[PDB]
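pipeline/complex-builder :: batch 7 item 3
reading input block
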Amino acid sequence: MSNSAIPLNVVAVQEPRLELNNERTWVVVKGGQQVTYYPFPSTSFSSNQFNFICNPPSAQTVLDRLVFIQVPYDITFTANPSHAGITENLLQPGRDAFRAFPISSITNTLNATINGFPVNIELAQIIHALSRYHTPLKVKNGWMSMQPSFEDNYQSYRDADGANNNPLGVFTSAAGLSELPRGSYTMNVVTNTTTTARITGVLYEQVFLPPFLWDGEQAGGLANLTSLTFNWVLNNNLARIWSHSDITNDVSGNSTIGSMNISFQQPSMYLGFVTPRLNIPIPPRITYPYFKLSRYTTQFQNTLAPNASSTFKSNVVQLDSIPRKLYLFVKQSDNVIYQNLNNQITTPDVFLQINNLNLTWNNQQGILSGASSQNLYDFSVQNGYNKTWSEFNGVTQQFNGVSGQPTKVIGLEGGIVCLELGKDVGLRDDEAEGVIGNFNLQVQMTVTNTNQYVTVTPDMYIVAVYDGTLVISNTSAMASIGVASKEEVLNARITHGVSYNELQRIYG
Amino acid sequence: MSNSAIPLNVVAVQEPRLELNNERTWVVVKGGQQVTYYPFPSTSFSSNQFNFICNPPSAQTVLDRLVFIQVPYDITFTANPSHAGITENLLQPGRDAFRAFPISSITNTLNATINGFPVNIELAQIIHALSRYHTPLKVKNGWMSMQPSFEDNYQSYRDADGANNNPLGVFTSAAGLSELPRGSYTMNVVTNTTTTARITGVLYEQVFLPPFLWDGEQAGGLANLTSLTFNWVLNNNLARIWSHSDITNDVSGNSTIGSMNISFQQPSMYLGFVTPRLNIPIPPRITYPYFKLSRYTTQFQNTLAPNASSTFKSNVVQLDSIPRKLYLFVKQSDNVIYQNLNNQITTPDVFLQINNLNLTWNNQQGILSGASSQNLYDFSVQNGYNKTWSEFNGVTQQFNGVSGQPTKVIGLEGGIVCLELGKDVGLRDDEAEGVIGNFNLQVQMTVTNTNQYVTVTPDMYIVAVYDGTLVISNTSAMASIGVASKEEVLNARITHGVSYNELQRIYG
Amino acid sequence: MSNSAIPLNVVAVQEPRLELNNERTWVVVKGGQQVTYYPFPSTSFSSNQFNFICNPPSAQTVLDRLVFIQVPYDITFTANPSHAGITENLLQPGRDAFRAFPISSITNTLNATINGFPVNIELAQIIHALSRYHTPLKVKNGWMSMQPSFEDNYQSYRDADGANNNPLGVFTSAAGLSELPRGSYTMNVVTNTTTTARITGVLYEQVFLPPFLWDGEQAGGLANLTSLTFNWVLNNNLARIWSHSDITNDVSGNSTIGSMNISFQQPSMYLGFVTPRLNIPIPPRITYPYFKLSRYTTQFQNTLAPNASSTFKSNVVQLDSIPRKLYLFVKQSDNVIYQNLNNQITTPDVFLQINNLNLTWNNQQGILSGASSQNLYDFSVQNGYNKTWSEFNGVTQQFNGVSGQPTKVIGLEGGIVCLELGKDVGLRDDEAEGVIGNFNLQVQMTVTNTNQYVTVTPDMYIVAVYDGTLVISNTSAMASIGVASKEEVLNARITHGVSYNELQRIYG
Amino acid sequence: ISSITNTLNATINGFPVNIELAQIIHALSRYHTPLKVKNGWMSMQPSFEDN
Amino acid sequence: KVIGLEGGIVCLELGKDVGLRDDEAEGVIGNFNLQVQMTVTNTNQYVTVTP
């Protein structure tokens, strides 16, 4: 429309209803012959160690990225004296289920070696701050549906009680085409009575960690291996699997349930080896993207409650490279939850509300200090936060209508910030999303306890994900970081032939 | 960038905040004038079949893809002796609503002949299976909304009576921004008493056949039509359109309702014809994608009750050309559902849970034997299945809180597996998923009844969908399957853009 | 695929599981250093007008598009005679919340001025209909989640309690991962009794005006400006921020409140900035898309009630150019809703159901004539209406099952049709969206009130939205409308590439 | 124990082959054996046919 | 009766037992982070031991 300011080109476009003329080909979709599903039953498993050794049938077989283990289980709980108490059954229609995600929240460290090169991630802590963060609605009803997956939205189970979003509800009570409560996940009960409860079922869980994936869409698999494996080591306390609502217990029982003994029977993983058609060849040595989770947790004893405000800091921690992303959040500290059976079961995994976060990049301070805590949300949802602003900063007020009564406040499970490091910190140049090395950061954020009932010693976490490339050939598994010279990055050409939105898709 | 194993090419992108500067065009939309909508009233509508003879206004007019038929009805119920009593009214607050979607499940076949070549479908069997596979809540609240659209997520209505997701619940009782259960759908009740009822309203529904679409997205409307016609032939029973729950009926048990009488007033189709500008001209003979749904059914004498497992042999079936995809699902055998009015109204749509399937081909034998039933759900969901894994494979527990009642088991919906052919099944070399050859499959599949109340009699369905081109010209029309040749498909040149994921979306 | 009518060119694509080889390339994402958020507290804010004046820190900084204001507020209520009494509190558990969305709802005109040229929208009217129109479930839980954003679907708040989709309700009672009801929004309750209530929080509203945005995608920020300023003139009545339910209060007709007063404290904008990394140069003069939203309405003296039909003409409102979109809906008349406080606080914001809209275009009398109400809605969800159809045209019965008091109906929110103007209305030859000429338009549509409680008078709106390039360059804010020529459109070379499904994404 | 098995499943090398056994075992039992082979390996289970 | 008998003191030689990346050695510099989380059982019968 060469009438505006500086002139510009016009193209015409066709409405969807009628094009109708354009060279329309027909695309024959070919995938290699003889796709197969293997089922390796773990050999060597204990209550504390699952141990699969699973090799590919050949070189030339390209195994698929989505892996997942299934595992049959057997739990028994026995009522405690002196309560008491107690009239009623030991399991309750609203009070209990499994903790999402059962299998991971127990695993100390999952571990796997692609082709003789050891790649591992720590599952226990990282996973709950990993759940909140990249799944929309569509994906939550897709693959991730296999383990209990509903997230902890109430600050303490006791308050949620009977509610329509209550995490531990039955199958009824969750609207249509919506995320189910964890009570709805099937298990069959041999006996449930006062004094005793014995239940049994089957638990699925997808192996998390790169270069495998729990995103829906997927890319090309890892030909050409000769070796593969998996090893999960589990915490010895192993009672963390169950979740229970405080409502029943009263004061000084304190609670009915403890103790309980969980047991496993040999689990078995499921791999999918396709093999390509003879006519079309795959290359001899091939490359893949590969990320890597790293965590440092800092604990300071001081205890704020029920709702005081304070400030914290972390010891400086040097890094060897800019990491692609970074996650900051204050959790209810781990050390206090572990002692005692009562406590381990009946505390949801939630975060404190961040009044303000200020952090320093390397030898540089004051970053993000000025931005409103509500602003923290704005640029993080853009990262993909998927949770109503209301639950981030969580605390909500419902007022009751009867004279001589005070209104009651409800704690709501705060948020977790994340700031893609070229996106939301900005970088002096030339520095990239990968370049080595040696930058050092520390964080100092001010939090507020919102939980209405318990004093909470807190803690801070920082998860980074370094980025690099893992090249597999038979038989090698070279991996790098840095990958680009600090000079070569300063003058690489910006191409308009991609959409920054394309790089959101490669999680991560 | 060169620094890992093999050197890799370097490019740099702009963060989305500062994407300027790139040359930016002003795009002018040119979509031809005269989008109008005609309302053809049926001539020769009887009690048994409606018929519409509706021709385009002129040559030169593109008839758009979405079409739908509105139909005013009338129904009367009559409480039967001697089930009495018989207290309160026949229609209840949340006890009943239209079976969804109604006038499609009644129709025996709908057949539309585009331009002197007939394109026919058999809906009564096909519909429910097709229904699940391509809905993303956003799409199921779009066009899919017009006919009551909520499918039964319970094995028996009985148990679901107090429940938030109840498939036939009143408008109050749906979550905000979600699917609404069939009790929502509006219509005037002239009377409701004990001993009689009568209801009157106009209910829509689309033509579901290919071509024409229920999928939201849309593409090129079929020009240059010169003739069109639609025939609906509906089954005798009719009583099926209504649904209703177990609890209310009693003690024999025999329901309150039977018998009842439906009617139809003159109906009417509704379709629109955009017409191009003289400027931008359209080709004299053009080609459209054309799928063809075909279904094969077997019946087994043998019963299982009410949660005992069994195996089944799918009957043999020789095809001419590889089907693009195919859907197998066991379900409750029809004949039973038809005999007797109450029985006919009472029982839902749902299937039995597939414990494992093992299909064969023409000498590739046992394919898919070892893949866990869970593994089955996975590859299916990638083709779009769209429901939590918990409700596929549906059995769920609700544990009871009172001493010392047993805990009750709820069946849900048996799943339906779908396997795109090039994708999961693995073709022999050089023949893709369209080509003409003689191949015959069988699908032996073991499956369990999970519904607690009735003995199931089973039946197995296998719905295949073939892919071909249909050239509509002026004047004549022409479809041909197996459009590619085996020597051709062997060596066809391989392209990167656009990749497959985008490709599937044209449905399907 | 040579052998089906006209030979079709035939290429092969690769599956997902095996990309496997395709030239992959490491990509440095380099976006400039320095993203920071300055908050500008509004000097000279009062109770009735806010005034910000936000200056650029320096040249060379892009200003990030997404802007939002954050106001702290304070309200006190009072019980009146003589409805009382009246026991219980003023504030009820599920009977009252903010009107969604509160702060803008009150605003007469939100006006800004970029770089010395003033652009404004009239917010109070526009907002509520331009609210339904472009959000999915994914986006309403994204940004828009900062204000209360659940929309009024009930024709009166009377019926809404108690139900799990009632707009004004407690946070619990919303099913997992869905639009939260408006009573969720957090805010402190200083005191609550019979005769007195008082609340004090802080609430945000993202600024709804182009070029600035409020939906998902994110696009290039405006550089380079030297001045920027805003001015909201709040409507004077300023009791419309709150909302009530009618169920409470006397059969006599009198309300609980009473009166109330509102007061704001200091309020403050939050602008993003970032300074482009020194090496890459942003061009001196740049150009952005911009849309001018304008509205007109016509009043009517006679009234209809409670559910009978009527028809209306609209006067000839002459649009100066052809706008991109055009909206049209019949709203309950303002002249009445602003009187008597009680009337002002307690009515929702919804529409009378359109039965047939038959409008006259540029020299055509009778475009869209005989398309069924159903038929109109179809083609508007391709403009992303989003809300389910049964809510559009809203009427919904609800039978009870007790003897023998006849069943109740419920009014539901009526739709608001929208015709995209080059697409759905169909345009002259050689003329297109941008093209500027003087054209007369006057709608004529019939509407039936569905709400069964009150007499309604009808306003009618017609909100257009134009298209023009605006060329920022310090210091000038050059604007245009109608940049393509009546000639030029003729022979604009049809090109794709460019996808129409992408074009529905660049929306304002 | 053959008479009690509902089904015996045995997968080899990753491809599962199984035989139902409650009733299929008695058909196969009378059929192919002769005296000299009946009295060999098949001597371990109490294997004399009900006549 | 049960006797507590003195807990252990674990010592891992750093390069040898812990494992160490390419081009790093016993006296190279500098700046790596270290964090250790081990779990302990008290054995001493008589006294409550703060640790």
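note: The first helix of chain D runs from residue 24 to 31.
queue -> next item
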